[PDB]
């Protein structure tokens, strides 16, 4: 592997819970002016979420509401890119988000 | 080139571990990612970490490693071209001696945080009916301190099972003690089933000859115009950092001076304490290496 | 491994990750030695030659996919609540899919439960509270595809006509459906695309079928599949009984496509043609070839 | 094993070209200036179809060469074109795979040099003419069919429905047969604004 | 061994050294224990008899070479896109060729796939990088071939003859092709080499058949192998038609060569001919026999 | 093998990424004068991309932006050429570029 | 040193950046990873200061075991590997025995 | 691959008919009048070569198809004829399959 | 095997990359006048390439 590459990965959604990526996880030097965004779509393409993570010197930390994630189906598609100052978005993580909760 | 130098030994890159602990967590407690703390570079154990205790010494520790290889043959070749190792199977083994309430919960497979010792004292610990499989968190610690430099050499296992317990002799002129086999396994929050490490300051001495990042060539000091106040208050003592070219805090290894404690005196840690008004010069240095600050004083 | 990820969906909708990141947060994991799961069954014939046996063709064969899973939770009841789970992912009726997603893409396979699942161990499973089940499912469909692709032409011209373009990435040839609304005579590629299976591969280059007239109200799905009828009318009219030994008879060759012409003509009210193209590949993974 | 190696008898071939997506394609390889020196101009003022040209953005003169060779030394090629300024356009012929040495057939469109020359190629983006020129005024829409006749060793330029040669030329010194059999073509403008450029191009073997 | 050598060029074109100097780098090996690969499968017939069971002919079987690849790269996306690249080298419908190289030359027996290939071991591939694939391949030609001898005679003359010499250096019979222009009526040699198949071998020593007379236009291929039609024009003509029920019979039988005879008469224009003898063999490599 | 090749290897290719490849997985020994370059292709021999890599003393850097790489398909033929100064290029990777992203 | 424990863990340990104050964490791979190096095994006999330098080339070795090892209070911590050698197709031997 | 292999769609076709075995051939196929609609007629009277027309015999007009098609859409014909006597003669280029449209 | 042979062996070639068989593979004492050179040919036998 010559490229830098996303990593696969499943993120867990609950109804009613509040959606949070812990920051011990998200390790990595992170410059001053570092960004965090966090892209959910479906099939087609269409966006259905995009959150900012709250990144530090050394984490990344998302953390959102129950109200933000209830459009967020089991099976959607989401990526995570960082963007460190004066450089272009870099995709760390991409999958796929499964729900982990009481199916109706 | 000579024999001796084409060798290029060192003796110091042997590492002794002569005390060694382990600790154990539950699989609940956040794993430890690595032990030095990020203050001052001591000895750090993450909370919900408990030791066993003694162990006895004749037994030592052991490490086994095993490993499932698989020969390549190919058709033109009378030799197998390659080997695939499809696994590395760590385990460990030691025989300790206390009968504490981890050693015994380890032991036997069971929780006994819900057992309450009778009226007086007394505690009975059944034997489950079915085993129960439990994780832990496994740290094995080892110190060898040279030269009250001590080094302190780790192994991080986030996710150890009891594979085997050997049998026990009662034998009424040794003590009783529990002889556990510890088979590690991958943790996948964590990304590894073992891994090892090293710190303290003798690490620090030995690192650039070990090989990992760069040789400590030019000693590079915190920005050298710091202003400090003569009257008490938040200003009144600045703190210095002492870093290497290869991204290592050298502060407790360099010796802090002052060539004028009266504008600014300098402790050991590289705090600089504003006493009279003016300039002063604070040399911290390693063997050959210096770094040297212009402090300024104000009342 | 993250290079490859195998997920169930389940007949009741339930969602199982199998292998792959994420796998056993449902409590069931994959176990290894999983057959006729990577090349679909292909059996080919041979008549006697001069040297042997001459080549005389190929059949696709169904999939039997055996493979074991286990059901695992440090209690019992749960344990049993998972397994009970599992076994109402599955049916003999009715199919549910089975996804492999890498570097390639996602392809589903439609299993069914080719016979009764044989779970546990010797002794009773609530022992342990994890247990192997062995399942024996089989794909009608051998093939592993993707989601068909679908393209819309609607105009309110009397006369038209457009470019669907068409193109079979995957290895195997496929079969388009077309969605025709009513009234209106339309006219629909059948190209070869150099298939001599009529011995017509270059005389049928540019074949164009003409569909019979429809009435107001004979909505057509015309498939070319060999598995349905072509002419399927909404209303129950018997539309293939006005087109005279005429058919489609070509599938999407592998590497061809073109832009494919369909006329509409003597439409009132203009007209909706609606065109699926399927994506079916004998591998769960594969890089693209051409 | 062989007794001789023989060339494989290839058959006459067809190729065309539109220019209706984004981006110009790998079908063109770009020339003299590098990659990324072509690109597609909309032209939506004049209502006309898009053509292919250099991308002004960053560069003025640019050369294409097809990516597949012609099987045959003698070939057609019928190009529709649009003038919606002032340049230079050159349909080449007989190129290498450098575009070193080529034939070619050049309409200039300006306030006095509204006319067509047959030039030999020095480089993809440098030429020199041979012969008189010919007076042509280029409309939008217009077709001009290149034919390049190796029986004849001629070079010639139709307009339109005409079968009488527009321009014409023979004996010219360009070298043929294998490894020299690839089209393309040309554009040079003074301005940074698209000139006359084609926005359909076919290639045959043979004439 | 750099005693041997074996390639597989696929039915796409693309080179891979399974064997020898150079073997593995485009990431495919050989395994060891590769089957019905060096001698062509006979079967020998036998009719009961006072003695017990009387010879009574052989024949020649298609050849089932089971053989195993190592498929290997240090990183799995490589290593899958090598995987996709050797799954993409093979078909079942059309044949790719696999040589071996020795002292004696370079033999080629083309083989395709006679079933699905088995993949990989019992967990997933992308945890090794370096994973077995079991090909079951089919010869239906089950003979080795080297590329054929041909030779050509051209003549301006009306009426001529030309002799080629032919010589069957390999261990099994051969079967001549000749091209021959038109107009023309052409005779060609059918010796029989002292074959006593037909009970006629000192009889056809000298055996020569006519061809029809051939029309302007109307070239034509002889081939005597019979996995083919004898006479077949250029111009879709029915010259076999026209030739009133004979045939080429004889095979070049081993051992045997010599200067067969070429007659060319009522030819205008004068005309040429090709003879092409292929070079079959039993084994991928052999000292040449005499 | 007379003659050494190249090495076959993979790219990743993202979307909304931008395409790096790091000059610790490209380290050598380049003489100031040194270049570097990267050429795309597709399955006909046109070239769908062409970048010039930084080359530094002791590494080879390549940074895109998302939009140049945008039009390579997954699938195409990469080639990877080094040019020391007064020399030919020579190839040291060439291969396959994959786009490892969620599909739509 | 670094060689000795990226030999132990089949890992290549040259991104292993020491912390703030020199410590290092050296994981083991999610699989082994299958590395090759080449050996050079030489051992000097001196004789009336004219020494014999007897040496083992192997142009390509990799890790085939590991031996458990022991932790004792009075003993340094060692590491016993296993290196087997294979055929390198560039120089055409496996192993090699010299002397100068 | 697709550098060096033309594909049968991507080549220039070239046929020719000439009627002097007075036979039609398989490669015309009657439209609309149905099989058995053309008939080749010998023109002996005067020095001419046998020609192509409807079957007189039970037609007074017919078309034949070439079995194969173009493989582009720009086309040249090249017909030689003869005038018998009164009568329409239709050229068509640019038809679809069963000859529903064309121009002529 | 009482007379010398050749050893087979493959060449690698790359399409805009410079052709290159280095010292050490061709090793061996070789006096001085001692002149190598490389020779191509296609399966007829017709030589397509000669190097020094």
């Given at each position: 592997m010559l490229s830098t590459g996303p990593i696969m990965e499943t993120l867990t959604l609950t109804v009613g819970s509040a959606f949070e990526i812990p920051g011990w996880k998200l390790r990595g030097e992170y410059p001053a002016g570092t960004t965090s965004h966090l892209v959910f779509t479906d099939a087609a393409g269409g966006t259905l979420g995009e959150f900012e993570g709250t990144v530090s010197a050394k984490e990344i930390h998302y953390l959102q509401a129950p109200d933000d994630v209830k459009n967020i189906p089991h099976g959607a598609n989401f990526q995570l890119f960082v963007t460190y100052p004066s450089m272009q978005p870099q995709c760390l993580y991409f999958g796929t988000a499964i729900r982990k909760e009481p199916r109706y | 080139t000579d024999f001796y130098t084409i060798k290029d030994?060192?003796?110091?890159?042997?590492?002794?571990?002569?005390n060694l602990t382990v600790l154990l967590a539950p699989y609940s407690t956040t794993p430890a990612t690595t032990l030095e703390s990020p203050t001052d570079g001591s000895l750090a154990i993450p909370p919900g970490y408990k030791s066993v205790g003694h162990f006895e010494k004749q037994a030592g520790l052991t490490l086994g490693n095993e490993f499932d290889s698989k020969d390549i043959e190919a058709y033109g070749e009378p030799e197998p071209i390659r080997t695939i190792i499809n696994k590395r199977t760590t385990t460990f083994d030691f025989a300790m001696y206390q009968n504490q309430r981890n050693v015994l919960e380890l032991i036997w497979?069971?929780?006994?945080?819900?057992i309450q010792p009778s009226e007086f004292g007394g505690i009975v610990l059944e034997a489950p009916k079915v085993p129960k499989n439990i994780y832990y968190r496994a740290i094995l610690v080892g110190m060898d301190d040279r030269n009250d430099r001590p080094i302190w050499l780790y192994w991080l296992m986030p996710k150890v099972k009891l594979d085997k317990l050997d049998n026990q002799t009662l034998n009424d002129d040794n003590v009783i003690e529990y002889k556990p086999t510890l088979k590690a396994f991958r943790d996948d929050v964590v990304g590894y089933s073992v891994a090892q490490g090293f710190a303290g300051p003798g690490w620090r001495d030995l690192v650039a000859t070990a090989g990992f990042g760069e040789a400590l060539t030019a000693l590079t000091i915190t920005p050298g115009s710091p202003t400090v106040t003569v009257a008490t208050g938040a200003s009144h003592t600045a703190q210095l950092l002492v870093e290497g070219?290869?991204?290592?805090?050298?502060t407790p290894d360099v010796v802090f001076t002052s060539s004028a404690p009266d504008k600014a005196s300098v402790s050991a840690a590289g705090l600089v304490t504003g006493v009279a008004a003016g300039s002063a010069t604070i040399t911290a240095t390693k063997g050959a290496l210096t770094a040297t600050a212009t402090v300024t004083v104000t009342a | 491994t993250d290079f490859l990820k195998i997920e169930l969906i389940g007949r009741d909708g339930s969602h199982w990750v199998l292998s792959g990141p994420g796998m056993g947060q449902q409590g069931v994991t994959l176990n290894p030695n999983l057959q006729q799961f990577y090349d679909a069954p292909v059996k080919t014939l041979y008549v006697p030659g001069p040297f042997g046996e001459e080549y005389a063709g190929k059949r696709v064969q169904r999939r039997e996919i055996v493979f074991s899973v286990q059901a695992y939770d440090e209690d019992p009841d749960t344990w049993s609540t998972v397994d009970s789970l599992w076994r109402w992912a599955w049916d003999y009726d009715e199919e549910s899919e089975l996804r492999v997603s890498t570097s390639d893409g996602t392809r589903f396979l439609k299993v069914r439960l080719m016979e009764e699942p044989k779970p546990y161990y010797e002794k009773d499973p609530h022992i342990t509270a994890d247990n192997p089940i062995v399942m024996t499912v089989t794909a009608t469909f051998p093939y592993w595809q993707d989601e068909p692709e679908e393209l819309i032409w609607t105009t309110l011209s009397t006369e038209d006509m457009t470019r669907f373009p068409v193109r079979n990435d995957g290895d195997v040839p496929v079969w388009l459906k077309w969605t025709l609304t009513a009234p209106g005579l339309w006219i629909l590629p059948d190209f070869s695309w150099g298939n001599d299976m009529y011995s017509r591969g270059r005389e049928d280059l540019g074949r164009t079928v003409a569909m019979p007239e429809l009435v107001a109200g004979e909505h057509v799905s015309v498939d070319s599949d060999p598995r349905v009828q072509t002419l399927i009318a909404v209303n129950g009219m018997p539309t293939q009984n006005r087109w005279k030994g005429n058919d489609l008879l070509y599938p999407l060759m592998p590497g061809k496509g073109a832009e494919i012409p369909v006329q509409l003509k003597n439409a009132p009210e203009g007209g909706a043609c609606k065109l699926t193209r399927p994506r079916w590949y004998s591998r769960p993974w594969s890089r693209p070839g051409v | 094993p062989l007794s001789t190696v023989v060339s494989p008898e290839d058959s006459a071939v067809q190729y065309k070209a539109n220019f209706v997506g984004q981006y110009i394609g790998p079908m063109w390889k770009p020339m003299g200036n590098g990659w990324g020196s072509l690109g597609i101009h909309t032209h939506a003022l004049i209502s006309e179809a898009p053509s292919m040209g250099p991308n002004y953005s960053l560069f003025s003169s640019a050369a294409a060469r097809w990516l597949w060779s012609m099987n045959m030394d003698s070939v057609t090629i019928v190009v529709r074109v649009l003038n919606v300024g002032a340049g230079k356009f050159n349909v080449i012929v007989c190129a290498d795979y450098q575009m070193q040495t080529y034939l070619g057939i050049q309409f200039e469109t300006g306030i006095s040099n509204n006319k067509v020359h047959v030039i030999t190629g020095d480089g993809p983006l440098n030429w020199g003419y041979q012969g008189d020129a010919v007076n042509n005024t280029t409309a939008n829409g217009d077709v001009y069919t290149i034919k390049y006749n190796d029986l004849l060793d001629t070079i010639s330029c139709y307009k339109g429905t005409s079968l009488t040669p527009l321009i014409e030329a023979s004996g010219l010194d360009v070298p043929h047969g294998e490894g020299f059999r690839y089209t393309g073509l040309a554009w040079n403008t003074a301005l940074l604004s698209p000139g006359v450029e084609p926005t359909a191009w076919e290639a045959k073997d043979g004439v």
């Open positions: - | 030994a060192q003796a110091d890159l042997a590492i002794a571990p002569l497979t069971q929780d006994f945080s819900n070219d290869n991204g290592i805090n050298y | - | -």
